[PDB]
Amino acid sequence: KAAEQYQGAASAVDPAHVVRTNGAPDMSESEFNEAKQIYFQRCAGCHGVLRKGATGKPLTPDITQQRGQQYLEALITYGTPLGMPNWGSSGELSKEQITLMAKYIQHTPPQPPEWGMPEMRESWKVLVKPEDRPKKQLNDLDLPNLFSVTLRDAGQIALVDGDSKKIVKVIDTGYAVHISRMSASGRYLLVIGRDARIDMIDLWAKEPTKVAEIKIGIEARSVESSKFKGYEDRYTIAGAYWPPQFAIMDGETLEPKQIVSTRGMTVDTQTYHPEPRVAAIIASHEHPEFIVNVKETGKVLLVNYKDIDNLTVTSIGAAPFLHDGGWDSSHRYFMTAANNSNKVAVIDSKDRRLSALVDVGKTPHPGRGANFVHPKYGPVWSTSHLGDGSISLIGTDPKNHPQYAWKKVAELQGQGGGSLFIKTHPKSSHLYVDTTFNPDARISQSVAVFDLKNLDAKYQVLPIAEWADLGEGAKRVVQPEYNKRGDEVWFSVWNGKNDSSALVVVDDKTLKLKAVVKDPRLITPTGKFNVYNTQHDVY
Amino acid sequence: AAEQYQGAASAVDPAHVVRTNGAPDMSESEFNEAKQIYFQRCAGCHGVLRKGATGKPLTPDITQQRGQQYLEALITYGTPLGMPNWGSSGELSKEQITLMAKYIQHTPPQPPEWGMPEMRESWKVLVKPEDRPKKQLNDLDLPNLFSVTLRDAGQIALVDGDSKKIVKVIDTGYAVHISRMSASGRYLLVIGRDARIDMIDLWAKEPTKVAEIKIGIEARSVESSKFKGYEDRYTIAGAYWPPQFAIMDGETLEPKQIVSTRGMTVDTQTYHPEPRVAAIIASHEHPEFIVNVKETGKVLLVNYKDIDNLTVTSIGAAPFLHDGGWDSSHRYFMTAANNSNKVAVIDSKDRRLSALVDVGKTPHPGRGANFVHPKYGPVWSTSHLGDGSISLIGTDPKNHPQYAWKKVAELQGQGGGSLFIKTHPKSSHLYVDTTFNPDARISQSVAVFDLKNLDAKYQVLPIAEWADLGEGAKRVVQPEYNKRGDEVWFSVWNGKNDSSALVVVDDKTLKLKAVVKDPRLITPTGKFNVYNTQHDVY
Ligand code: DHE
Ligand code: DHE
Ligand code: HEC
Ligand code: HEC
């Protein structure tokens, strides 16, 4: 009773300013669920789970009811020239369905489940204990030259032998694996699905097999391993889109250790954002840390794992909509794209500060980028764009080239916009650029190639999907990727689930077709990661 | 192109994202009537999103499962585990309780956020630092001044220690919770439960406000940078709503950084949507602030060496962190995890949790009471709300390792409902109030222990009776010494329409020394002696 009177006073919060949400149009269960289904299949991607993920005004009740039924239907029907597609004019959705979506977004956002340690541990499984694993490589595969390829819609990945061009093993994983990363020892391949399901694969087993698995959220895209001297296979980190968090697990067993929320204040307006999805994650070579990208808030977190019981995080402000990125040639500066802000943030991992924000083209999408030495400007890091056909070259040598450091030193012009990946290798005098989402089929099915030794000459167009000899289907070409020795570049001919796909290999020295990988198992091939190049960040 | 890039389906399954409702319909006046009772009577314990109390949360999933009648009965009779009885006591009507039962079955109404735009809008520089005096422009004994909170008046009074007179009364935020001093000893910082901060220059002809800002909707703590070379550099404040804390310029109060405390709990490691910020103490070992985050049980070490790239070290402790203070050496932060009945020891130098000491029922130390025990060496003590015990915890790892972080001994007071324990380097007494004890005579008096003879029972000083105030609850609260340590002040916290007073005792003789009355002295609660607060003398 004493403690009850102690905490008995009135809250300083005024009841009058605490608002009940409603005033939305009536819709039955059948109706609400149908809309909700359409929302996560078609809208959530850009707008997010809580509808504050896209640029412009959020789709929350305060705003939507202000706009009204008519405006919403009209907006959803025709779209806008700023990234919002037209669902009615295209014939994607029916007027009946648009009427439902307009009603739906006027309601409070249905809540998805949280996912903490109890859920994580429940999902955690150690298939083969560290003790029961081989002490040395039990097969005679050339592991460094192996290619972990994603068989997207199949919810699997295929290990492809570099030299033989044959599929060695097919493994079941989470749905639509987004990326593959390698442990610092080069022994374990880590894969994570969009469903946030991670799988640890042992390349030393007689036949490469899964030794651990866990689910770190409802939705995810990134996973990474400790790469600081003396931390080989110590920790594994993964970022989720929902819930807004990242989890640190044991590098050997995938046992969940810490889960950290990314919900917080934005860099630009410094207001609270309830859903800051975790984008790229890269491991620091200068300090025992993980460099995490937090999209909507535009923050780059340096999570120190030297002591994970008492986690130390340094929050660096960058720019809103942080997505992909990669290291500069020296592996000290994290060159990351803030695509909707049309900028590239430079994070110094040694000094641990934002070195600069470079202005670039419309919607920069560098992937991990492409590093090379410019004859005139010295070391540069480059990126292509989704918003245009330009390629930005940024100087990355502060020490010996201060005149060009962090400057969009020069540009190149590819086939057009819709570009996803740019690429090159130390031993190569070529630069590859795809155009996966370019609305012109001929362009989307081919890749441009520049001559690093004559940057003034126009690119050469390589007909990848055509060299595939596949037949009907979109046949979208995506992500150029070199082999261990960098004498050949691989491309994925991303065709439909019921269509035929392939992996095309070009002779880097001659720019001629060298091979074409086909297999009934190769369904919707997307990302490809050569074991050596991914592990040693060779790009 | 970008529309096809971001055009695939979300990995989130539509079938698992849930629409909330199935709640008892209620009109606007019914919902508002209930909502007003919730924030007047319930929010304190349960919180804004109803997950602040122990036991099950009052969210729709649990409430609708329990149902209408279960809820009404629970609200009507309460429970022996801290939930008051509203019907049995006759506080709420059967009609209102029914409204409350239906109300908690609905989604919790949302209070607004409070970011940088809102913060700057409230920010005001009343007197620019360049226009402020360069020397003390008055004859006041600043070190021995007491900053007294006149709770319901939304003001504070600066009382002269020796003269016992009200030197100045200042308008502030409502019900100021605490007063803190800057390291230079020039500025006094006060923050109201309404999250409104006020900076006061004691060097002006008449001590006056030079700056003000609002850092949330509800708050309790504020603090200034005390690391060497950082005198008056930054000012931090923690809020209850939103769940955040803010760092500002320590000269102008200009908002600089805002950090959300929403996160994962230390125990269950699950997501908590409302981890309120409790105590905050400035480190002397490193340039960092030590923040207590309640519901998640985390102690954050926020480094201000580079405010642009904020570094924060998260130390897990135990759930329900509240008040705390330094050990005699000013190196270990002794803080109470009140509902967990534990005191967490945070090593500010090595930056780690040194221990979790089991204590009595609901410990409430305030900043605590340090002193050297004849047998056990230097200890830190704390009283309780749940019982009449007083825990003495060893705080010397160097010379008394056998006693370090151990509940070395115990003392017994008049009973539970205690809030503060006090002593001083120059004093040989130990005072403990019992403010919320259900017995009028007990709540109106304090206990005093002889530190030179701890085996002996305590003496009871009749503080309220010495005040000669007449009717009213006359709750005595928080002992506080003067700069010399020979006087101990107490507040006689009566109603706003009643008469209150400040009683002063001669520490050397335990005899009444003075009584401070004044028509302006409305509902006096916290009292902060400038020197003692500034140099953490307790
Ligand atoms: C955050 C993020 C990264 C960087 C992770 C890292 O390196 O740590 C990344 C990288 C990648 C990489 C990494 C390549 C590399 O070289 O590192 C690939 C191949 C890839 C295949 C695709 N990505 Fe990706 N991608 C997203 C998110 C991301 N993708 C999306 O949210 C988006 C826009 C929408 C979606 O549907 O998920 C999206 C669409 C795509 C595709 O359309 C691709 C081609 C096929 C697919 O499965 O969706 N993304
Ligand atoms: C977080 C917190 C601190 C530590 C701050 C710091 O050290 O930086 C504190 C300290 C304090 C201190 C500091 C004393 C000290 O000597 O350090 C005082 C005087 C004080 C007066 C009161 N507090 Fe306090 N107090 C709360 C919160 C807190 N109180 C509550 O939430 C609670 C339980 C409920 C409420 O109504 O706010 C509460 C009730 C009270 C009271 O009932 C008091 C006596 C009168 C009032 O104004 O409500 N609290
Ligand atoms: C990304 C590829 C998108 C998808 C898929 C959908 N929307 Fe969108 N939407 C997107 C952007 C970038 C914007 C801003 C447009 C602008 O000109 O500012 C929008 C905007 C809307 C709006 C209007 C918001 C307002 O101003 O009040 C609505 C109502 C809207 N989007 C609805 C919506 C629905 C219902 C969608 C799926 C069926 C959907 N969007 C998909 C980006 C994208
Ligand atoms: C702290 C001083 C409290 C105040 C004021 C109010 N409640 Fe509370 N309540 C409190 C605790 C510690 C608990 C747990 C009690 C237990 O023995 O488990 C509760 C519990 C409830 C519940 C029941 C939760 C459940 O089991 O489903 C309800 C419905 C409840 N409290 C309602 C409620 C209302 C409506 C209040 C204000 C009018 C209120 N509580 C105040 C602590 C405190």
Of B5, B315, B435, the CB nearest to A437: B5
* Residue A498 contacts B, CB cutoff 8 Å: no
Integer Cα distance of A81 and A342 in angstroms? 17
CA nearest A385: which of A452, A334, A436, A351?
A436
Query: Max Cα separation, chain B?
Result: 85
- Which residues in chain A touch residue B345, judged by CB atoms under 8 angstroms apart? none
Location of each CATH 2.140.10.20 domain in chain B: 112-538
What is the residue-wise DSSP string for A463-507?
Answer: -HHHHHT--SS--EEEEEEE-TTSSEEEEEEE--SSS--EEEEEE
Tell how far CA B182 is from the center of its chain.
18
Integer Cα distance of A13 and A419 in angstroms? 50
**β-bridge partners, A126:** A212
Q: Ligand 4 in contact with B75 (CB < 6 A)?
A: yes
B478 labeled part of a ligand binding site: yes
CA nearest A527: which of A28, A179, A282?
A179
**CB distance A356 to A392 below 8 Å:** no
Q: Is B258 in contact with A270 (Cβ distance < 8 A)? A: yes
- Which residues in chain A touch residue B241, judged by CB atoms under 8 angstroms apart? 13
* Structural biology method used: X-ray
Q: Which of A107, A273, A365, A385 is catalytic?
A: A365
CA nearest B241: which of B58, B431, B51?
B51
Q: How far is the CA of A178 from the centre of ligand 1 (A)?
A: 6
Angle between helices B94-103 and B28-37 (to 10 degrees): 100
Q: Ligand 2 in contact with B175 (CB < 6 A)?
A: yes
A221 labeled part of a ligand binding site: yes
Cα A25 to Cα A32, A71, A103: the distances in Å are 11, 14, 6
What values do phi and psi take at A95, rounded to 5? Answer: -60, -30
Integer Cα distance of A397 and A336 in angstroms? 16
Residue ranges of alpha helices (H) inside B353-424 are none
CA nearest B206: which of B262, B158, B150?
B158
The 3-state secondary structure of A321-369 reads: CEEEEEECCCCCEEEEEEHHHCEEEEEECCCCEEEEEEECCCCEEEEEE
**CB distance A384 to A433 below 8 Å:** yes
Integer Cα distance of B392 and B412 in angstroms? 11
Integer Cα distance of B468 and B503 in angstroms? 10
Location of each CATH 2.140.10.20 domain in chain A: 113-539
Q: Work out whether strand A272-273 and strand A278-283 pair parallel, antiparallel, or are unpaired.
A: unpaired
Q: Work out whether strand B176-181 and strand B166-171 pair parallel, antiparallel, or are unpaired.
A: unpaired
Tokens 């079938």 belong to which residue?
B15
CA nearest B247: which of B226, B224, B263, B231?
B224
Cβ < 6 A, ligand 3 pocket = A 38, 42-43, 45-47, 54-57, 59, 63, 67, 72, 75-76, 80, 82-85, 87, 101, 105; B 3, 6-7
Kindly state the tokens that stand for B418: 């205690």
* Residue A118 contacts B, CB cutoff 8 Å: yes
The arrangement of strands across the sheet holding B332-337 comes to B321-326, B332-337, B342-347, B352-358
Angle between helices A69-78 and A95-104 (to 10 degrees): 130
The CATH code belonging to domain A113-539 is 2.140.10.20
A323 in active site: yes
Strands (E), B395-450: 407-412, 421-422, 429-432, 446-450
Report the amino acid identity of residue A383.
Answer: T
Per the omega criterion (within 30 degrees of 0), is the bond before B207 cis? no
**CB distance A465 to A446 below 8 Å:** yes
Q: Which helix (H) or strand (E) holds B506?
A: strand B501-506
Rg (CA), chain B: 24
Integer Cα distance of A391 and A433 in angstroms? 9
B220 labeled part of a ligand binding site: yes
Q: How many CB atoms lie within 10 A of CB B382?
A: 31
Chain B nearest CA to A383, separation (Å): 16
Instruction: Give the angle subtended at the CA of B220 by the CAs of B214 and B225, to the nearest 5°.
Output: 80
Location of each CATH 1.10.760.10 domain in chain B: 1-111
**CB distance A162 to A483 below 8 Å:** yes
Q: What resolution in Å is listed for this PDB structure?
A: 2.9
**CB distance B442 to B434 below 8 Å:** yes
Integer Cα distance of A81 and B113 in angstroms? 31
Q: Which of A84, A265, A287, A536 is catalytic?
A: A84
Q: Is B82 in contact with A118 (Cβ distance < 8 A)? A: no
Rg (CA), chain A: 24
**Ligand 2 atom at minimum distance from B435 CA:** 44
Interface-testing mutation among B4, B6, B10, B419, with chain A (most A C-beta atoms within 10 A): B10
Q: How far is the CA of A193 from the centre of ligand 3 (A)?
A: 26
Integer Cα distance of B316 and B300 in angstroms? 9
Location of each CATH 1.10.760.10 domain in chain A: 2-112
Integer Cα distance of B320 and B313 in angstroms? 19
Substitution candidate for ligand 1 out of B6, B10, B12 with most atoms within 8 A of CB: B6
- Which residues in chain A touch residue B27, judged by CB atoms under 8 angstroms apart? none
Instruction: Give the angle subtended at the CA of A14 by the CAs of B46 and B155, to the nearest 5°.
Output: 105
- Which residues in chain A touch residue B264, judged by CB atoms under 8 angstroms apart? 116-117, 245, 259-261
Residue-wise burial string across B441-455, b where 16 or more C-beta atoms lie within 10 A, e elsewhere: ebbbbbbbbeeeeee
Helix (H/G/I), strand (E/B), else coil: A114: coil
* Minimal-distance CA residue to ligand 3 atom 40: A43
Integer Cα distance of A337 and A179 in angstroms? 17
CA nearest A535: which of A201, A207, A266, A188?
A188
For chain B, first and last CA: distance in Å?
66
Q: Ligand 2 in contact with B366 (CB < 6 A)?
A: yes
Of A5, A260, A312, the CB nearest to B313: A312
Instruction: Give the angle subtended at the CA of A311 by the CAs of A306 and A316, to the nearest 5°.
Output: 100
Q: Which helix (H) or strand (E) holds A104?
A: helix A95-104
Kindly state the tokens that stand for B413: 């007071």
Integer Cα distance of B392 and B397 in angstroms? 15
What values do phi and psi take at A480, rounded to 5? Answer: -70, 140
CB neighbours of B357 closer than 8 A, spacing ≥ 6? B342, B343, B344, B345, B391, B393, B405, B406, B407
A273 in active site: no
Integer Cα distance of B298 and B275 in angstroms? 9
CB neighbours of B27 closer than 8 A, spacing ≥ 6? none
Cα A386 to Cα A55, A114, A372, B98: the distances in Å are 16, 33, 22, 58
* Residue A26 contacts B, CB cutoff 8 Å: no
Integer Cα distance of A164 and B277 in angstroms? 61
Integer Cα distance of B124 and B102 in angstroms? 43
**CB distance A221 to A239 below 8 Å:** yes
Q: Which helix (H) or strand (E) holds B196?
A: strand B196-201
A285 in active site: no
* Residue B79 contacts A, CB cutoff 8 Å: no
Number of residues assigned to chain B = 538
**β-bridge partners, A489:** A482, A506
CB neighbours of B370 closer than 8 A, spacing ≥ 6? B326, B327, B328, B378, B379, B380, B381, B395, B423, B538
- DSSP class of residue B42 equals I
Domain A2-112 sits in which CATH superfamily? Cytochrome c-like domain (1.10.760.10)
Per the omega criterion (within 30 degrees of 0), is the bond before B242 cis? yes
Cα A7 to Cα A10, A445, B53, B198, B402: the distances in Å are 9, 68, 11, 25, 37
Integer Cα distance of B114 and B238 in angstroms? 13
What values do phi and psi take at B223, rounded to 5? Answer: -165, 160
* Residue A44 contacts B, CB cutoff 8 Å: yes
The arrangement of strands across the sheet holding A525-530 comes to A167-172, A156-161, A146-151, A525-530
Q: Which helix (H) or strand (E) holds A131?
A: none
* Residue B456 contacts A, CB cutoff 8 Å: no
CB neighbours of A58 closer than 8 A, spacing ≥ 6? A51, A52
A with B: how many residue pairs have Cβ under 8 Å apart? 256
Integer Cα distance of A500 and B47 in angstroms? 57
Integer Cα distance of A18 and B411 in angstroms? 45
- DSSP class of residue B384 equals B
**CB distance A72 to A66 below 8 Å:** no
CB neighbours of A79 closer than 8 A, spacing ≥ 6? A85, A86, A87, A89
The CA-based dihedral angle spanning residues B251, B256, B261, B266, taken in that order and rounded to the nearest 10 degrees: -70
Q: Which helix (H) or strand (E) holds B292?
A: strand B288-293
Q: Which helix (H) or strand (E) holds B211?
A: strand B208-214
CA nearest B448: which of B467, B469, B463?
B463
Q: Which helix (H) or strand (E) holds A216?
A: none
Integer Cα distance of B362 and B168 in angstroms? 37
Residue-wise burial string across B457-482, b where 16 or more C-beta atoms lie within 10 A, e elsewhere: ebeebebbbbbebeebebbbbbbbbb
Integer Cα distance of A507 and B375 in angstroms? 84
The 3-state secondary structure of A23-77 reads: CCCCCCHHHHHHHHHHHHHHHHHHHCCCCCCCCCCCCCHHHHHHHCHHHHHHHHH
Cα A289 to Cα A245, A297, A380, B313: the distances in Å are 17, 20, 25, 14
* Fold type of domain B1-111: Cytochrome Bc1 Complex; Chain D, domain 2 (1.10.760)
Q: Is A265 in contact with B115 (Cβ distance < 8 A)? A: yes
The domain made up of B112-538 is a member of CATH 2.140.10.20: yes
**CB distance B243 to B258 below 8 Å:** no
CA nearest B347: which of B406, B402, B285?
B285
